[PDB]
Design a protein around this nucleic acid. Structure first.
Length: 175
RNA sequence: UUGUU
């Protein structure tokens, strides 16, 4: 597939980029290798992990299948751990998720889904409830794209007041 | 009791 950066743990601290390139190139072409370093004192030191960026997702997956939880590098007591790097995380859920406040306590998950369905696909909708299943009068709504969440906010924030509520509905990005 | 899982 397209390029992807993988985080790799249980790499011996003595290994450099050269050693890592050699290992990974067995499975697919490597764009870049970067050993994570600690510069807190002299000299800089490997943190025992690296990033490897493969040109294709296919290569990354083949390396993962071959290595993750399978290959134990020299001196290690656990096998390589490999997964996509944090920097590759794209649609953080946290940035696509709305807090909906001041909704009626009678409001159902389905009620909220319907109210907000016109703005995009809703991947999740949860009413916050207390111990006795009573609504806390608020919800979380996750859209598939933040774009759809912004659209809902502009259209729905304080647009109406629901049954039993002291103020208009609150629609905003979740904390 | 405006309540952010």
């Amino acid at each position: 597939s397209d390029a992807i950066k993988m985080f790799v743990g249980q790499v011996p601290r003595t290994w450099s980029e050269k050693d890592l390139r050699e290992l990974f190139e067995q499975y697919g072409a490597v764009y870049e290798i970067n050993v994570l370093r600690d510069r807190s004192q002299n000299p800089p030191q490997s943190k025992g992990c690296c990033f490897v960026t493969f040109y294709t997702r296919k290569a990354a997956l083949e390396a993962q299948n071959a290595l993750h939880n399978m290959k134990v590098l020299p001196g290690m007591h656990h096998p390589i751990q490999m997964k996509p790097a944090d920097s590759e995380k794209n649609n953080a859920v946290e940035d696509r998720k709305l807090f909906i406040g001041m909704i009626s306590k009678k409001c159902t998950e389905n009620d909220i889904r319907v109210m907000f369905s016109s703005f995009g696909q809703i991947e999740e909708c949860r009413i916050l409830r207390g111990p006795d299943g009573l609504s806390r009068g608020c919800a979380f709504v996750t859209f598939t794209t933040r774009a759809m969440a912004q659209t809902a906010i502009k259209a729905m924030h304080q647009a109406q007041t629901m049954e039993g509520c002291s103020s208009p509905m609150v629609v905003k990005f979740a904390d």
